[PDB]
Amino acid sequence: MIALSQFNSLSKDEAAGLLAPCVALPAWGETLVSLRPFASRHALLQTAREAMANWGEDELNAALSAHPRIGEKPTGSQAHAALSRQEQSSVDSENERLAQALREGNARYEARFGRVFLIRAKGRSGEEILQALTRRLQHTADEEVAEALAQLREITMLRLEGAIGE
Numbered sequence: 001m002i003a004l005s006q007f008n009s010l011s012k013d014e015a016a017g018l019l020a021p022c023v024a025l026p027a028w029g030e031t032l033v034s035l036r037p038f039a040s041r042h043a044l045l046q047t048a049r050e051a052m053a054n055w056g057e058d059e060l061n062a063a064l065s066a067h068p069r070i071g072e073k074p075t076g077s078q079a080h081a082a083l084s085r086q087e088q089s090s091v092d093s094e095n096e097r098l099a100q101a102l103r104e105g106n107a108r109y110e111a112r113f114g115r116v117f118l119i120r121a122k123g124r125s126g127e128e129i130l131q132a133l134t135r136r137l138q139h140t141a142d143e144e145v146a147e148a149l150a151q152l153r154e155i156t157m158l159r160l161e162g163a164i165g166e
């Protein structure tokens with residue numbers, strides 16, 4: 001976590017590099033970098049929310065390139081992999097029934113919608129995620145695109161909030 005005044009003074013490449021792990025959508029980060037300096041962390045976060053307001057199915061698809069499946073915890077030490085592992089920390093990997101249910105739930109979701117199941121995993125157990133998956137399997141395509149995008153927005157914001165402090 002770096003301070004706001006520090007973020008405001010970074011070179012364009014260093015600032016974009018800092019924001020890159022939040023979401024695999026270069027336009028989002030580029031917008032934030034281009035609008036520096038920010039008056040406050042409050043203003044930065046608000047601007048960040050505004051910049052994700054017009055995201056659609058195309059953004060969902062592009063962002064999903066950097067998100068592993070729930071239950072498929074990455075091992076890498078780099079920000080992306082470390083963040084995902086940390087976000088899935090409430091998922092019990094030792095529970096064999098859960099692991100199998102997650103694999104089956106994922107396959108079922110992917111067959112239905114054509115994309116990986118996306119959920120803000122931070123603070124959610126494997127059971128909570130499974131129940132969300134069961135609920136979201138009943139959605140129309142548009143309803144599901146909307147929720148998946150809402151979850152993407154949450155993931156991105158939490159990562160941003162963890163990257164830049166007051």
Ligand SMILES: NC(=O)NC1=NC(=O)NC1=O
Pocket residue numbers: 067068069070083084085087088116117118119120121122155
């Ligand atoms: N497929 C996913 O939902 N993946 C993830 N959600 C998170 O919050 N972290 C992930 O890696």
